[PDB]
Amino acid sequence: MPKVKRSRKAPPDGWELIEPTLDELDQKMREAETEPHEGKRKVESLWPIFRIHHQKTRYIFDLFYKRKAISRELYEYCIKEGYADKNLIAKWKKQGYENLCCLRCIQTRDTNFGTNCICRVPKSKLEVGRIIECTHCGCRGCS
RNA sequence: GUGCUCGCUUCGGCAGCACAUAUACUAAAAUUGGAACGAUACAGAGAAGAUUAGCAUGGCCCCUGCGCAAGGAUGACACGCAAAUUCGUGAAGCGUU
């Protein structure tokens, strides 16, 4: 039933209170995963996945660093069991990147010129506010 | 948006400085047009008397095949062929009478 777990050992003792939100988010990700490809779009059908991923990982980032309500061993375990995302967290550590939409939208190779996608640009630089949903994430102005 | 100014300065905002910087055939679309070796239906097989094995040449003809192999009715099509030429036409120049 759960994210059937490879480590075979006991999850530490702070795991049962992060359990319910984690699971419900997981069943949620399964529903957003199954939501089937109607006249929806093709480029826009992966956006919910990056929502829920960012959400999972922002949750565990709260329950470690912002509240200090989890042991670091349980933390690395929740990294290893796919509930968290190592590289999202590792960027979120940086200065300008608090609200990173996903890890790709800063991958410069995915664009022709080797620059980040406009998702990264602050809203002040535009000053015109034409609504932009970044192709990769679907995000609207992460930072 | 995060943070720091022994910032105005309370815990509000505002300020300032630091960091963070530019995706995209933008379309779920909308047109636009050839073909399917499918019926149909016609049509209907090289060489000399007859029945027939092929291997080629040629070129805006292709198909199956990894193929520089092999096959496809000898894969098909090649089917007027022109031409100079035996003697004259005339035309125009250069010299002779």
Ligand SMILES: [Mg+2]
């Ligand atoms: Mg042959």
Ligand SMILES: [Mg+2]
């Ligand atoms: Mg032939």
Ligand SMILES: [Zn+2]
């Ligand atoms: Zn963004």
Ligand SMILES: [Zn+2]
């Ligand atoms: Zn983006």
Ligand SMILES: [Zn+2]
């Ligand atoms: Zn994004």
